[PDB]
């Protein structure tokens, strides 16, 4: 198994960021990659054993440390906005198949006054749809959040569902003409009309948002845009 | 030694997908490896080969006789097969980037298309509602809004597994006074039998 | 009549501080024709015979890159054998590799070789069938199970039946 820590991280530019990778496969090689749309998966640094470090394809602004055979760390001593990315470590026995970790999503911000939590609204199934197709679609909208660093999940009767769900692959910019634009994201959850018309069924759209921490400074009189969960809900309607 | 793939490929569920890979400068010290990366995950090993064709439960790998090209073959693709597929050479100790790979999209086979545009209203009040374009077939393409104060998302597929039923949908919403569901998707070519309630 | 091509490689880990040294010497019909030495000023394959000079820079560049990769492989697997035999690091140890081909008077392959020895003792060797392995001790049997799962014999057989023969005939046309 290859584990990564943390799973999510938000920091202001110029700060220090450490990503941790562990590997219990007894493998010699370990790797640090970054993932960005338009470039694919690019190699940053790698290592064939404890104490060994070898430069990858895009190493500027990163150092790495292989303290043991299990542990490999990626260090960003002066984090910059271009290092916003999705980071994957991996292990390998020589040139055999690589095994990848779960990923660390990192956002590096130039200014924390741009951070806004999302607002979440659930939209109930149209009765013309319940009649015309005997099915019911709930739509969820997460609007006005910055940075683009959220996870949206549906919960029926208090447990998360995946069947009938589809979420937009990426958010859209509410103000595409601005480098500081906030984002919006839509999702849909479709059930049977019979399931929607039972008034004991509870539905909740949940948006996990990664923003500032308690340690970060905040002097605006807007509520502090901390990491948080914003949900919206709806009950089954008998008519 | 580098590989080259077409960066995207469209397919429909139930089709057998042939993903090509070009590696003309391959040597005898390198294997052909294929990885799969489903959204929000890291790549995972699919298969690999040297000279002979190779088969396992995930894919078939066809290698040209001169080894200068490759084909990952996926049988009867389902929606879960949509992913980025990376074809890379491994060997000689060369540790390189994976690159972009090939983005495989898998559209549902909608043989009972019932295109409609519904209006849905906020569970909490008030004034707020969205327009939902749903149940169209996969050859319908949803275009972006030309007004910058109207937001429309691209088509997306949900799969109600218990009921063995899949459907497409795109969502449009706005705070503009003149926005209505009958007008939301006008900049998109829509089935002329699209059901409009009200 | 019959002809042969052979490579002998050695990797010896150094005293306490430095990294190992890797040498590679090739023979055509029992005459040394190329050599690589990691301790050289700038390491690269060099011709040991005048009729190997008629090869372009692409040839020496490419086989030199192979040699760089092989050096890394030797570092990694000497560390692995340190692990297998439970020996303290910072010592001196030797990995020796011999591989090549004997082709007959009809131009095709009579015998292939691929074999490894550790500290002067046989470690693992490819049998004449080019499909099975002879492993001299327990650790070698670990490696053997790994190489059976990994299809190593097919990889080596692909080299010995194909590019070994063709490259040898090529070097003989160079005479």
């Amino acid at each position: 198994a290859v584990t990564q820590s943390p799973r999510n991280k938000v920091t202001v530019t110029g700060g220090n960021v450490t990503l941790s990778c562990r590997q219990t496969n007894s493998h010699n090689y370990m790797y640090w990659y970054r993932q960005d749309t338009g470039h694919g998966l690019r190699l940053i640094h790698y290592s064939y054993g404890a104490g060994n470090l070898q430069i990858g394809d895009v190493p500027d602004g990163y150092k790495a440390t292989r303290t043991t055979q299990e542990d490999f760390f990626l260090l960003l001593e002066l984090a910059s906005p271009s290092q916003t990315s999705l980071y994957f470590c991996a292990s390998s026995d020589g040139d055999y198949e690589q095994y990848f970790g779960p990923g660390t999503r990192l956002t590096v911000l130039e200014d924390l006054k741009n951070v806004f939590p999302p607002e979440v609204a659930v939209f109930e199934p149209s009765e013309a749809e319940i009649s015309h197709t005997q099915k019911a679609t709930l739509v969820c909208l997460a609007t006005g959040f910055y940075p683009d660093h959220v996870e949206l999940s549906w919960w029926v009767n208090g447990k998360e569902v995946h069947s009938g769900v589809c979420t937009d692959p990426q958010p859209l910019k509410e103000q595409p003409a601005l480098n500081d634009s906030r984002y919006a994201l839509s999702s849909r959850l479709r059930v049977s009309a019979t399931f929607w018309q039972n008034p004991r069924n509870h539905f909740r759209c949940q948006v996990q948002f990664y923003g500032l921490s308690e340690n970060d400074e905040w002097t605006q009189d807007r509520a502090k845009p901390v990491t948080q969960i914003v949900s919206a809900e709806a009950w089954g309607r008998a008519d | 030694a580098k590989t080259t793939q077409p960066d995207s490929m469209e397919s429909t569920e139930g089709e057998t997908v042939h993903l090509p890979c070009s590696h003309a400068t391959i040597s005898g010290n390198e294997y052909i490896y294929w990885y799969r990366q489903v959204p929000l995950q890291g790549p995972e090993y699919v298969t690999h080969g040297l000279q002979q064709n190779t088969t396992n439960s995930m894919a078939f790998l066809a290698i040209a006789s001169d080894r200068k090209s490759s084909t990952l073959i996926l049988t009867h693709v389902s929606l879960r097969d949509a992913a980025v597929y990376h074809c890379i050479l491994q060997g000689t100790g060369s540790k390189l980037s994976f690159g972009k790979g090939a983005k495989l999209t898998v559209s549902p086979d909608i043989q009972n298309p019932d295109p409609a545009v519904y209006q849905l209203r906020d569970s909490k009040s008030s004034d707020k509602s969205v327009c939902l374009f749903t149940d169209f077939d996969s050859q319908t393409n949803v275009s972006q809004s030309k007004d910058s104060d109207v937001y429309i998302t691209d088509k997306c597929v949900l799969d109600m597994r218990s009921m063995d039923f899949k459907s497409n949908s795109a969502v449009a919403w706005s705070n503009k006074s003149d926005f209505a569901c009958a007008n939301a998707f006008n900049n998109s070519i829509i089935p002329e039998d699209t059901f409009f309630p009200s | 009549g019959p002809h042969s091509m052979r490579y002998y490689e050695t990797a010896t880990s150094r005293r306490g501080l430095g990294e190992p040294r890797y040498t590679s010497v090739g023979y055509v019909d029992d005459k040394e024709f190329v050599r690589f030495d990691s301790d050289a000023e700038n390491p690269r394959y060099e011709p040991q015979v005048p009729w190997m000079e008629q090869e372009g820079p692409e040839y020496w560049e490419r086989i030199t890159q192979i040699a760089k990769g092989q050096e890394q492989w030797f570092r990694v697997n000497l560390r692995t054998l340190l692990g297998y035999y439970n020996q303290s690091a910072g010592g001196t140890h030797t990995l020796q590799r011999m591989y090549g081909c004997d082709v007959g008077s009809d131009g095709r392959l009579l015998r292939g070789y691929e074999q490894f020895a550790y500290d002067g003792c046989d470690y693992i060797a490819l049998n004449e069938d080019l499909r099975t392995w002879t492993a001299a001790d327990m650790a070698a049997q670990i490696t053997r199970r790994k190489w059976e799962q990994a299809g190593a014999a097919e990889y080596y057989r692909a080299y010995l039946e194909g590019e070994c023969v063709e490259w040898l005939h090529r070097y003989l046309k160079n005479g």
């Binding site: 020589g94 | - | 192979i66 697997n77 692995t80 080299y159």
Partner: peptide
């Protein structure tokens, strides 16, 4: 031309 060992011990 040399052969890369490839396979791991």
């Amino acid at each position: 031309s040399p052969s890369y060992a490839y396979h791991q011990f």
